[PDB]
Amino acid sequence: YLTHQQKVLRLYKRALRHLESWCIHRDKYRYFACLLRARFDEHKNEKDMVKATQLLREAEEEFWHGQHPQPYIFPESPGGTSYERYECYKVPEWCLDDWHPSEKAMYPDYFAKREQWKKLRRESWEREVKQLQEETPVGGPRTEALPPARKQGDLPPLWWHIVTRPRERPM
Amino acid sequence: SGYTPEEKLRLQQLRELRRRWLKDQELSPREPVLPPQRVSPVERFWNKFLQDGALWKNVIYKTYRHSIFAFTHVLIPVWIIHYYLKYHVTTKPYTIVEKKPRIFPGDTILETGEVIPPMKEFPDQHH
């Protein structure tokens, strides 16, 4: 799952941001941000995993009862006022293959470079398949992490869409 | 919890590709290669006349833009509407009905010259 170290780290970040919402004013937040840090500092290490869970479960209950009903959200994060505001402007690149030649002629340089990438992408595909069926157990991969290229001149497996993905503000 | 050596290597391998890719998404000085778009005589004439700042000839230019707009958007349409209303709409019964003008005590009627009596005397007040 997520171990036990990570849960407390995640809870600490949420508690500060929810606390930051109630306080609003920065001076108050600094005063209480360190106070809340101290309450974490009191029970650091402390071993006793059985008692460690009890402190976290009590912590989560306290956080839930005291969380801000309307926490501040970054404008471009899940829940924000600008989340996915530009997804309608993000057009994939395979649509350029469907362009008419009369409108490709408006960008002779850009499509000259594309042929290099498409040419590059075709030649490297076979190695990427080999790079993936060698660095993978018999019973198929057991993680979503991919290996890099174990050579010079070999691109990382499964890079085309990761690299060529639409820009964040395409227009 | 930091990146494993393989994870951080892969990011750098991709991070160099993406920076290269985003660099390719740039327009050369010629691009876009527009076709031979001809310019009408009005367009070219104004460009030469607008070279120098000469504030005194920008109010005139603004007046010209508004004069044309006020002609093709306020003068031609009103001609069409007035021609429409005066000779096609007003020629049919009750198409345009206007509330009768208010008549006040002590007026003069233009149609017949009638002079309504002014009013009865008031019980003069103050304050």
């Binding site: 994939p92 469907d98 008419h100 009369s102 639409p166 395409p170 | 740039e26 327009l27």
Partner: peptide
Amino acid sequence: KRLFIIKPSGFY
């Protein structure tokens, strides 16, 4: 620094 804006084919 003008960049290339990818759009679907507007010719058709």
